[PDB]
Structure formats: structure tokens, C-alpha cells
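Thread: Modeling a multi-component assembly for a lab meeting

Hi all, long-time lurker, first post. My supervisor asked me to bring a structural picture of a complex we are working on to next week's group meeting, and I have zero experience with this. I have the sequence lines for every component (96 residues in total). Could someone generate the structure of the whole assembly? Inputs are pasted exactly as I received them:
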Amino acid sequence: KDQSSCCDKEIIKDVSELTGIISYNTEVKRWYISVSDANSYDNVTLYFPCNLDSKYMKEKEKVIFSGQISKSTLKITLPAGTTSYCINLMSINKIN
Ligand code: NI
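Re: Modeling a multi-component assembly
Sure thing. I ran the full set together rather than chain by chain. Output:
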């Protein structure tokens, strides 16, 4: 817990033990974790980790993760009901 966040901006909150799928965004040239909301058809949240181990940088890698989320000033083109955050990962594990 004696660790500083890699995100530039103020931590909003922590996300805990979320299930997501890793992909690479070719516009911003970054890896992210996509978490789909079971509440609706279009609500997806993308978490862009600034401390992701390169062993997870594989298309469609399924992980369970926790971390500190912040807003990011990253300019990214996303559909209407898709939002994104910077994340300082505190835990991440591959799902088998
Ligand atoms: Ni610590």
C-alpha cells in the first residue's frame, strides 16, 4: 500500500476483482482491459493500465484485476456508452 500511482491525475477510487478482456487500441497505441456491464448492451468501461506487466499484453487475455483508477487526459475516439480510465494495477491474474 506504500506505493504511488503511475496515473498522472487524482485517484477517484479503487476497482476490485473485476473480470476483463485485454486488447490493444491502435489509435492511442495502448493496451487496455475491457469490462462489460451486465446491466446493459452498450455500457463498457476501458481501463488503461500504466503499470501492466508485458506478459499480459496479448489480444483477448482474460484477467481478474484490482487497482486505483483516475481520469486521463488521453484523447481517444470511443462510442457513446463506452468510458475509459487510467488504472494503477494493485493485482492482476490470468483466468484459466
Ligand atoms: Ni505498501
